[PDB]
């Protein structure tokens, strides 16, 4: 993978060519208002050590940071996503994988409008990497899951239960 951040929008500015997962951005620029994704699939975080709002960038180029659903113009931290050949999450109606489940392989750009239940508080993911976005369309809030539990919505870093679709981290192409 190769991320390029730039300080100003269009890509301009002090710049910072990345292949890594970062812990800490600040030492290489202080603000971000574009990227040029080359390839991988990154997470961004607005602060170091992989805290507050995540953001969900694949290859391509963002001019403004409202292209990648960005709150503001923070990166400080960031993930290199791995490849991901097959994706499996369970998807439970309440907290610690109690009432309803249904397992899924595949996209979904709706959560109620598609399943038997209509409430979504806790996910096993059992193979892959995928966004959780807090509405439908895979708009609003994001939050990366890995493989591994999530009880409750404070496992996935959100500061509520609010969600709306998922979708599997695959590249473009």
């Given at each position: 993978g190769k991320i390029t951040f730039y300080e100003?929008?269009?890509?301009?500015?002090r710049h910072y060519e990345c292949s890594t997962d970062h812990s800490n951005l600040q030492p290489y620029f202080s603000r971000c208002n574009s990227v040029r994704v080359d390839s991988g699939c990154w997470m961004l975080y607005e602060?170091?050590?992989?805290?507050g709002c995540q953001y969900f960038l694949r290859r391509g180029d963002y001019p403004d940071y409202q292209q990648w659903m960005g709150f503001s113009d923070s990166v400080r931290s960031c993930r290199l996503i791995p490849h991901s050949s097959s994706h499996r999450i369970r998807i439970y109606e309440?907290?610690?994988?109690?009432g309803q489940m249904v397992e899924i392989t595949d996209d979904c750009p709706h959560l109620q409008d598609r399943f038997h239940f209509s409430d979504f508080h806790s996910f096993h993911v059992m193979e892959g990497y995928w966004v959780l976005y807090e509405?439908?369309?895979?708009?609003?809030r994001q939050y990366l899951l890995r493989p591994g539990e999530y009880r409750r919505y404070h496992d996935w870093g959100a500061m509520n239960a609010r969600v709306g679709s998922l979708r599997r981290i695959m590249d473009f192409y």
């Amino acid at each position: 993978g190769k991320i390029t951040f730039y300080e100003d929008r269009g890509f301009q500015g002090r710049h910072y060519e990345c292949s890594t997962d970062h812990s800490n951005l600040q030492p290489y620029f202080s603000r971000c208002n574009s990227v040029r994704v080359d390839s991988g699939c990154w997470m961004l975080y607005e602060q170091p050590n992989f805290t507050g709002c995540q953001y969900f960038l694949r290859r391509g180029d963002y001019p403004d940071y409202q292209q990648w659903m960005g709150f503001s113009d923070s990166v400080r931290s960031c993930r290199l996503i791995p490849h991901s050949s097959s994706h499996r999450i369970r998807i439970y109606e309440r907290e610690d994988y109690r009432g309803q489940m249904v397992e899924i392989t595949d996209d979904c750009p709706h959560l109620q409008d598609r399943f038997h239940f209509s409430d979504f508080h806790s996910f096993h993911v059992m193979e892959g990497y995928w966004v959780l976005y807090e509405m439908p369309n895979y708009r609003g809030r994001q939050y990366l899951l890995r493989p591994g539990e999530y009880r409750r919505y404070h496992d996935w870093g959100a500061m509520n239960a609010r969600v709306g679709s998922l979708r599997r981290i695959m590249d473009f192409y």
